[PDB]
Structures are given as structure tokens and as C-alpha cells.
From Swiss-Prot, chain B:
It comes from Severe acute respiratory syndrome coronavirus 2 (2019-nCoV). This is Spike protein S2'. Residues 7-49 form a coiled coil. Subunit of the fusion protein that is processed upon entry into the host cell. Mediates fusion of the virion and cellular membranes by functioning as a class I viral fusion protein. Contains a viral fusion peptide that is unmasked after S2 cleavage. This cleavage can occur at the cell membrane by host TMPRSS2 or during endocytosis by host CSTL. In either case, this triggers an extensive and irreversible conformational change that leads to fusion of the viral envelope with the cellular cytoplasmic membrane, releasing viral genomic RNA into the host cell cytoplasm. The chain holds residues 943 to 991 of 1273 of the full protein. The lineage of its organism: Viruses, Riboviria, Orthornavirae, Pisuviricota, Pisoniviricetes.
Curated annotation (Swiss-Prot), chain D:
Attaches the virion to the cell membrane by interacting with host receptor, initiating the infection. The major receptor is host ACE2. When S2/S2' has been cleaved, binding to the receptor triggers direct fusion at the cell membrane. When S2/S2' has not been cleaved, binding to the receptor results in internalization of the virus by endocytosis using host TFRC and GRM2 and leading to fusion of the virion membrane with the host endosomal membrane. Alternatively, may use NRP1/NRP2 and integrin as entry receptors. It comes from Severe acute respiratory syndrome coronavirus 2 (2019-nCoV). Changing S24L: In strain: Omicron/BA.1. The chain holds residues 348 to 397 of 1273 of the full protein. This is Spike protein S1. Changing T29A: In strain: Omicron/BA.2, Omicron/BA.2.12.1, Omicron/BA.4, Omicron/BA.5, Omicron/BQ.1.1, Omicron/XBB.1.5, Omicron/EG.5.1. Binds to host ACE2. RBD also interacts with the N-linked glycan on 'Asn-90' of ACE2. Cleavage of S generates a polybasic C-terminal sequence on S1 that binds to host Neuropilin-1 (NRP1) and Neuropilin-2 (NRP2) receptors. Interacts with host integrin alpha-5/beta-1 (ITGA5:ITGB1) and with ACE2 in complex with integrin alpha-5/beta-1 (ITGA5:ITGB1). May interact via cytoplasmic c-terminus with M protein. May interact (via N-terminus) with host bilirubin and biliverdin, thereby preventing antibody binding to the SARS-CoV-2 spike NTD via an allosteric mechanism.
Amino acid sequence: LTGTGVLTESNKKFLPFQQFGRDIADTTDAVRDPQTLEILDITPCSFGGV
Amino acid sequence: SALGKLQDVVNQNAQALNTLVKQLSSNFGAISSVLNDILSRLDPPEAEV
Amino acid sequence: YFKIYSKHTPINLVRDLPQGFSALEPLVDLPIGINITRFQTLLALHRS
Amino acid sequence: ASVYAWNRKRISNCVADYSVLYNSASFSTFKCYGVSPTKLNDLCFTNVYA
Ligand SMILES: *[C@@H]1O[C@H](CO)[C@@H](O)[C@H](O)[C@H]1NC(C)=O
Ligand SMILES: *[C@@H]1O[C@H](CO)[C@@H](O)[C@H](O)[C@H]1NC(C)=O
């Protein structure tokens, strides 16, 4: 799964089966990292109009 | 339902935006709706299609 | 893939199914790759 | 096996080096459809069947 974003701590109580999370666009918004099983939130990097 | 006229405008704008974001999840006949999957899975001659 | 979804609920109804809502969490995602068209459950006898 | 009774083997829980398949000249036909041959070392899979 490829993508760009800032990986931050999260407070989403994922259930054991649950691995990732999806937004309305179906783009991944949270992910469970392998090897360490922690849940990292994925927030798109800051952008806007110059 | 006193302020329905403003609420209809807000709901229509939010619904149009929501449908616009829902359109990203459709592949439109391609193998996948994600660009990153196509860039990671295929060579440029089929990736351009 | 043979998916087993399971849920355990504490109930106190005597005869029929209880009326309520309980979502079944996925328990086992099983990699078998075989054809299944017929099934049979297993019970346990009591001997005295 | 013969083609009417073609043998299906499951491949799971392994790290696979496909670069020895691309760089080998012993195969007369090495043709991939849903995936690029050179990207196979960069992706993760499940339900692999031979
Ligand atoms: C390796 O990954 C597994 C699950 O994928 C995990 O249980 C284990 O703790 C990991 N080991 C290390 C050393 O990170
Ligand atoms: C499974 O077996 C039934 C007959 O019991 C057959 O009709 C069906 O085509 C088989 N399916 C597969 C996927 O082998």
C-alpha cells in the first residue's frame, strides 16, 4: 500500500481483526504497522492555494 | 422546518462534494481505482491506458 | 477462503432465538481452497 | 501433472525473490498480465497459487 502523509498517534479503538481504515474517498486514513502491531493514523500532508 | 431554504443549499453543496469524493473510488473500467496501485503494478505501456 | 465469523452472547431466553442486535466479528479467515457444497454439524453424546 | 488434472500448490508465509525468475533465460515464455514482472520484488501478496 503506497501513499504520502504524516503518521501520527491515534485514539481509534481498532478491533483485533481490523487493520486499516478508509475515508469517503476509500483512501487509507489509518493503518496498523507490521512487526510492532501499533495503529498509526495517516493524515494527508498540508497543502493549499498560493 | 423554518430555515429549510438555507438548509437545502447547505445540504446540496455538501451532497455534491460528497458525490465528487465518491467518484474517486470508481475505476471507470480500469483494473483499479487507485493510481498508486497502477503505478506500482504496471509498466508504462499499459499504465498509460 | 473459508471465513468463519463468530459472536458469543450472554442470553437467558428459554426456547427460541433472542430478539436483538449483535454484530459477528470475523474469527478465522481460513486458507483451504477446496469445494464445499454440503455440511453436517457434530454433537456430543452423554453416556451413563 | 496433466492439463485436465493440473496441480495447484498454495504459496504462503514466505519471502519470494522473483528476480531469479526474470533474470533466468530458461523460460521460453515469461508473460505477466495483472502485474509488471520487475515490480514483483516490491509488492506483497496473498492467495498465491501455482
Ligand atoms: C514480526 O511480525 C509479527 C507479526 O507480523 C509479530 O508478531 C512479531 O512480533 C514481529 N517480530 C519483530 C521482531 O518485530
Ligand atoms: C463443486 O462440486 C459440485 C458437485 O458436488 C459441482 O457442481 C461444482 O461445479 C463444484 N465447484 C467447484 C468450484 O469445483
